[PDB]
């Protein structure tokens, strides 16, 4: 009788109904900045800002000042900021130190900044939960809050920006954050000068992480599969509902799958899916950054550092992949795009399934995100093509700064790389550490 | 003044039990009929846990009786739980075909409206590393407890049988504890998946779910308050996974409490060293030990010497080698009439007896094969009957009478064939295995 | 469920094996069984009776007790009887208990007197039970010639042996704590035993302690299996009395009652009438006046006490009179037991085929307020005792006439002259009503 197990998974997802008028796309980091400030000013009930980090720079200051200002003008407003515990406490003078100063320089005005530790050490888990919850809306982006993400000062970091007004969804997400994160073990205020040091809360974090391993949104679906819907998703570790949905989503492409990821480093299981689609005669588009649009890339004139080898390693991944699937490139089934715009940086994430599904997420679609980090998403089901104008405009602009790679040879090989890079990579591959690196970054 | 072993048993929580509410059955056919009878007359719930439920006449009989009872009483809570991996393959070496899970799907389609869910329990990511050896048919306020799975031979459909043990125990509290434990830990556990769903996942897709599930199971135990002292008839349900389970500890402590005699049934003689050490201590203390195992020919992997030999048909021989090695070392105790080893054999019927008798006072009924596999890898359970007043004596004795009826006593280890006496292909295979020391590995995984 | 079934459903119940319940059908068998169990006892013998008489029958039992204690000095032997009854003739035993103790030095068989009230007429020890190891041999019988059918004349009672560790423990332990170690219990084998007035205040405090002494134990058995529930009570609101009250309305088919002296309290009569109205059946088995132990043949010199059998007959006739309609519809059946000059002492209650109350309770106002009473309640929902239940009722009925009409019972006019005059005198001043509340 029934459909294949992949469509079944998606058909039976709980779905919240959504008005087309209540979904607003933004196409540029500057618009995103201004929208965030506007919504902070006009907020009436609550502001919940979850980000990887909020930087002690002009961009980040702008946001924190706007938060203090909104709380001053409406002291009944429920303002919370949640960032990664470990990231906020490292580069000299840290963000956490700055959050402390801010709280002292603004007495009476209550703007709590909580640090979420997803694991005992940064390398083993970070807060990749995304969402600015403002009243009945969620402004959802992969962006953290700093100069480049907000396009202060002339250089930018490209992300995606969607405002979704939806009482039920925002409640579900606000409430989930309240119970599981804010009131979770081992969450600790970063605006407290006496905040513990990581070792002191090590055991709290272990128990916290286990609590998170099966924390999921719980809500009843109110929408069928014939109408515009949104489905919030959250996950930590291999068997999360998010990861399962990402896995099942890809095979439902009857025509074409599109993927954005900053660092091309797909887990094997998602690669196998890609290859199956290509074999079934479908289309697959993959939009990644050029090595030079990576934020770790160091110009060849400057002093080379160890970390500036990452963009090269991601290129090697892309070139190996393309190499194996050049046949499908030639049939115009597989399309790989390299984004590049002077020395601006690329941070696009997401998944398009035909014209019907749009995953917006913080998920970099790499092994790290699949096991270690706390990830979330919104899954937009648009079976009636109501978002078609905006979907198409967004893809138009994403592609605008892209080259299509028509041949794996168009990508530089290790031989073409600078000498220090070349030596480093050969050393790494000798002892097989390249494989480990790709599982932790 | 009590030794640590008796202390362990004295302090076990125990549920009280009426002698009138314990019914033994002595033959696989009676067990079949009793199961069908209880399915018909069930009023509230039927929970069938088995290793497998086979797509054969015997298994069909049972599944049809389940559908029929649910049709006549739609409020009845019917569940079937079998091993995830076992349900999705043929028997070993036989021509891969339609699996049980495929059949469970057909059944559900051919009986719309009638809700008889069949769940697959994966105890580990691969069959060889954990199977569902939990046992129990929970029907209302009773548990019909056997080692038997549901197929032709276990149920003595069609003239050939597989000998197991069969006890019906009516006890509200115990059945509740077992029904509730299954509900929470298994049925609602991670990585349990319906086998009557045509779209059921494949093992690799749920691999991580199964890993987390197994860890949850590693310390899942019955929790209940004992209502009975050590002067009255009691039952104590036990469940375990892995070396330090409460079951395993109870089995370990149980054996030394034999003031007179310990009796053991196991299908495959392959005792872990720790249980062997206990046996030897009993023999040294001057006590008696009876061990009832199958002859090699009563093993279900045994292949008649006329037929084409296959690799798997070496297992009965390996179990015999284990028995012969054991007896060899303890021949002194055989001679003093302390150690008694029995070989069961009845034409080409097969032997699947499990359990432990401690004097006339304790009776462990279990699915536990008492081998290293059961000790570490599989999800095992039991009921421990404490009968300090000898109220079950008629039935206990009748059961042992009939078990022994098809047995030879082995008076000398030499009465067992040596490798030299075995068929040529067998002999060559075994010598090859022992050369590279794989015999030791085999005995820890089967 | 209605409140009556609910009461019974929620009673704590001890499980019981059908193999461990043995009925006996005749007083002689009961004697022999008692002696057998005394011989073979290994741990304890606790004999509670109204009295143990200084006659051949009673001697037999006391000698068997001394003998068993001689052969096993570690055996815990106790005898408990009524304090007041043991220290008088019929209308003393204690003196005899003293002699026995002196004639058997070294052998420790203590005889305790239990006073349930300061005067006999206001409370007697109607607790019943011979507790022997893990069994209770339960009868209404005291220990004397007729109860034990020594010497050719007998007193009909009921006899059940129930092997059950838990129940016997509960009963043995309850006796230990509440009676044996109770205030105002005193040894009757002591020549220097106090006189009632000296312990009067002890008895008052004792009685108050007894007013809410009840068995405390956890039920181990559901309502789908054979069970036993020990019950004990003193006074109107005891658990026993409540259970007797609730038991009767649970009869879906038929209620059977034995009582030696027909003198039901009004509340139990009202229940009976409700059953009859609901269309159910009620069987009542009592003694003929001549099977009463106070009955004096009409040739012999009449004495005041020999009026009691007549008063019980008047009660029966008044009851039947009011319910003759139900006699006619074959719902109400009244049986008179009579076997030459043997006497009748049957007590109990059958509810359908499912419940059997065995008790010392005469089901009269005295037993309801004044005396220390107990019982065992057998629940047999699976009809496992059906052979024995039916055999017992068969033999009980064997010496019975069915009363088909209240007029078949003699009226006061038909009674001997001295009786007739006495009764008319009593009813003139309304003392008949008082008598029925104290005997």
Short mmCIF file of C-alpha atoms in Angstrom, two decimals, chain B residues 72 91 175 250 291 298 315 356 380:
data_model
loop_
_atom_site.label_atom_id
_atom_site.label_comp_id
_atom_site.label_asym_id
_atom_site.label_seq_id
_atom_site.Cartn_x
_atom_site.Cartn_y
_atom_site.Cartn_z
CA UNK B 72 -13.23 -11.70 19.81
CA UNK B 91 17.78 -20.97 9.94
CA UNK B 175 3.22 -11.15 36.29
CA UNK B 250 22.14 -15.40 42.08
CA UNK B 291 24.34 -32.85 35.15
CA UNK B 298 19.97 -35.05 20.33
CA UNK B 315 29.03 -28.29 17.17
CA UNK B 356 19.05 -25.73 38.35
CA UNK B 380 18.57 -13.56 30.09
#
